[PDB]
Design a binder for this molecule. Structure first.
Ligand SMILES: Nc1ncnc2c1ncn2[C@@H]1O[C@H](COP(=O)(O)OP(=O)(O)OP(=O)(O)O)[C@@H](O)[C@H]1O
Ligand SMILES: [Mg+2]
Length: 283
């Protein structure tokens, strides 16, 4: 691990535990001694580009990586600014931002629970139609809130939706720094998420772009894996509608809503979050 140790201090903040360590940043549970509250701290830390120094600052693994490291840092800042525009229970709440240690940090609300990806891996039996229908209203609300301010998410999958102990969802992360690094470094595999990204993200984007990815999330919850990669579908569409597969315990209404969100062409999908929510009515 390249993480800061329990007990490390950023003035009033104290690191408690590194709870997420990925290729592009680290997430810590931390404590604010001034306000006496637990928070999360997200640290930009692209492991392909940077390493942890002895004094716990971050340094370049090679001098050739500097421009890409800086571009990722700029995208990390821009993502924090985007999340700072909102005060919504389903969107990661940003408390503070600062630069230190040769990198950057976001202080955010600390959420209970774990990711949807972990819940699906660890407790798939909890995820049935009734649970999905309880998840959708607050998840629709969070996504629509982004859209109504004129933005798109563009990185939805199971990996970046937190499911709190209350079962309410939170969108944690838009992948901005990761995607910028991938574009600049020709590491195309870290930009789009295979099976979640629709055809128009491969090179015309709008709310329907996020709606497809949400359909892919729901498809994964229902049958256990995402639909075929959208570029492959654009050549020979091998997607079998869920209404035909008929997984046990799922209504045609929910299944058809997923199939419609997964329509190959943007114009054939629900065009807004409100339109997709309407498909689940009439039951
Ligand atoms: N604000 C937050 N509050 C609480 N937990 C958070 C917050 N932000 C991120 N997390 C957690 O950070 C982790 C980020 O996942 P990541 O893949 O980067 O790390 P990981 O160590 O591989 O963890 P995992 O086994 O969950 O994949 C997730 O487990 C997620 O729940
Ligand atoms: Mg992980």
């Amino acid at each position: 691990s390249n993480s800061l140790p329990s007990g490390y201090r950023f003035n009033e903040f104290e690191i408690q535990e590194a709870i997420g360590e990925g290729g592009f940043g680290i997430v810590y549970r931390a404590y604010d001694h001034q306000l006496e509250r637990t928070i999360a701290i997200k640290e930009y830390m692209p492991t392909s580009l940077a390493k942890r120094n002895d004094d716990l600052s971050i340094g370049l693994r090679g001098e050739r990586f500097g421009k890409t490291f800086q571009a990722g840092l700029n995208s990390f800042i821009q993502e924090a600014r985007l999340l700072a525009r909102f005060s919504h229970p389903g969107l990661l709440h940003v408390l503070r931002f600062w630069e230190e240690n040769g990198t950057a940090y976001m202080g955010t609300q600390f959420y209970s629970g774990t990711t949807l990806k972990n819940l699906q891996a660890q407790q798939p039996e909890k995820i049935d139609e009734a649970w999905i229908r309880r998840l959708l209203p607050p998840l629709f609300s969070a996504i629509n809130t982004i859209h109504q301010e004129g933005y798109l998410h563009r990185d939805i999958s199971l990996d970046n939706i937190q499911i709190q102990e209350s079962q309410l969802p939170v969108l944690l992360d838009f992948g901005s720094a990761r995607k910028e690094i991938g574009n600049l470094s020709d590491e195309t595999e870290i930009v789009l998420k295979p099976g979640f990204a629709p055809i128009e993200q491969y090179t015309e984007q709008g709310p329907w772009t996020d709606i497809y990815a949400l359909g892919a999330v729901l498809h994964t919850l229902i049958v256990g894996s995402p639909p075929p990669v959208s570029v492959v579908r654009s050549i020979e569409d091998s997607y079998q509608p869920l209404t035909e597969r008929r997984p046990a315990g799922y209504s045609p209404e929910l299944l058809r809503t997923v199939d419609r969100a997964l329509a190959l062409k943007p114009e054939d999908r629900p065009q807004t979050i409100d339109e997709m929510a309407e498909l689940l009515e009439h039951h």
